[PDB]
Motif scaffolding. Structure first.
Motif, PDB file in Angstrom:
ATOM      1  N   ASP B 229      11.355 -31.627 -32.930  1.00 26.41           N
ATOM      2  CA  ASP B 229      10.575 -30.477 -33.141  1.00 26.41           C
ATOM      3  C   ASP B 229       9.800 -30.179 -31.830  1.00 26.41           C
ATOM      4  N   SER B 232      11.876 -28.688 -29.508  1.00 22.09           N
ATOM      5  CA  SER B 232      12.486 -27.288 -30.087  1.00 22.09           C
ATOM      6  C   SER B 232      11.114 -26.162 -29.876  1.00 22.09           C
ATOM      7  N   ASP B 233      10.052 -26.591 -29.993  1.00 16.88           N
ATOM      8  CA  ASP B 233       8.947 -25.906 -29.639  1.00 16.88           C
ATOM      9  C   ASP B 233       8.826 -25.289 -28.200  1.00 16.88           C
TER      10      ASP B 233
END
Ligand SMILES: [Mg+2]
Ligand SMILES: [Mg+2]
Lengths: 245, 244
Positions: B229, B232-233
């Motif tokens: 994440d 991903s962010d």
């Protein structure tokens, strides 16, 4: 906007179309120093060459090749001696062929990136899922570098990037993935005079799937090999049977 | 015991270990037909690997990798072994090199297949007996899902101090880059310590420097540390697919 110092290496050696493509693209907006093996190291072990002098060749454009240097030798020498000031990032590639699966640690492309994981920016390992669109792979790498200079991502790690072998306009996008897995399924012999008997023939989120579906695959990797859980469950196992005759 | 290695079936390290172990245990040698220290350690996933069988039983897999020797040994060539061992390597396997080591790799294939596994290495060239003695001592244990990674000083067995449960370092802090020239004036670089030190108190590096058998519980790292994440962010926040 400012000029990032990039240590560029690979597995395939200084002459490879993948590293030379990337280098040209990167020299447009970054300061690029190439330190790569003197030969193609596919199938060759990686390790740091300790206590053994490594000869250095310098090309016309300033690329440097290390004689019998592993990808990790090149990164080690580039970081600690050959690029001054010290590089901000290590990029490894563009490799000719993919680097997917849990077997990527045994690859020279990843190995070079792994050696540069302690730098200012996380290392990039970049492989093309084929042998044609180096342009696409070089474009994907540039986008990544521009992004890192904009908002830095946590260091001590590497991104394993796999780029589909497609024209840039056909690439569907970029996914953050996790590594896949390929492998008892051994077969039977078939030697003409039967020379031997013992023989062999050996996910929706995996890196394999994203690349097959036309996406750039990015897998964040780190190296940690010890548990504090194991450290004393074998330490109390060692002091169990200590010194005595 | 299934005994393999990285430096080949005829290697001194594996022959000295197979002899010393044949005292306590039964051993089956399946090792590469040639020295593989310079070769990649992955399985050869889609080809037919020949084998050679010597009079003493030893098996050499032609063009085999150290992992191939464990896979091909267990699931195709050898009763099932109690412990898979990776012969005494000629040369250390310390720090980051364990990811790359063929000796370590052979043990790794062992536990993937679901076996206890040991990998052992000599920090030098001479005292294979010392290393064999240390391994035999260690194998004499109550007779973790992690391999032990063992490094032995190159000293007579009596000169060896202790045995340390260690972790892996990255690269040795003492190892610097030293510029050199040859008689032709060619530029050369030498990686390693100019003499003696300053290693991490608990590392594999540290123990060997101080004449102690380093033993490390080990499992290779292809994990993300659940940092999926985080990245991903990051691709959303900065334009990465924008310029196309
Ligand atoms: Mg390659
Ligand atoms: Mg070896």
């Amino acid at each position: 906007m400012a000029s990032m110092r990039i240590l560029l290496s690979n597995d395939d050696g200084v002459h490879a179309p993948g590293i030379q493509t990337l280098a040209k693209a990167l020299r447009e907006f970054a300061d690029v120093q190439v330190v790569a093996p003197d030969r193609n190291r596919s199938g060759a072990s990686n390790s740091l060459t300790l206590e053994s002098s490594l000869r250095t060749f310098t090309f016309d454009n300033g690329d440097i090749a290390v004689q019998m240097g592993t990808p990790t030798d090149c990164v080690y020498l580039g970081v600690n001696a050959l690029m001054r000031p010290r590089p901000d990032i290590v990029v490894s590639g563009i490799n000719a062929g993919p680097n997917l699966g849990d077997d990527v640690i045994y690859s020279g492309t990843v190995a070079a990136a792994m050696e540069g994981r302690h730098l200012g920016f996380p290392a990039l390992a970049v492989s093309l899922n084929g042998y044609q669109h180096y342009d696409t792979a070089a474009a994907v790498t540039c986008a990544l570098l521009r992004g890192l200079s904009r908002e830095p991502l946590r260091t001590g790690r590497i991104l394993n990037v796999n780029v589909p072998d497609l024209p840039l306009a056909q690439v569907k996008g970029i996914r953050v993935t996790r590594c896949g897995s390929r492998h008892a399924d051994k077969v039977i012999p078939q030697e003409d005079p039967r020379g031997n008997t013992l023989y062999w023939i050996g996910g929706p989120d995996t890196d394999f799937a994203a690349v097959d579906e036309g996406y750039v695959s990015v897998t964040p990797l780190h190296v940690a090999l010890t548990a504090a859980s194991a450290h004393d469950v074998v330490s109390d196992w060692l002091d169990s049977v200590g010194v005595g005759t």
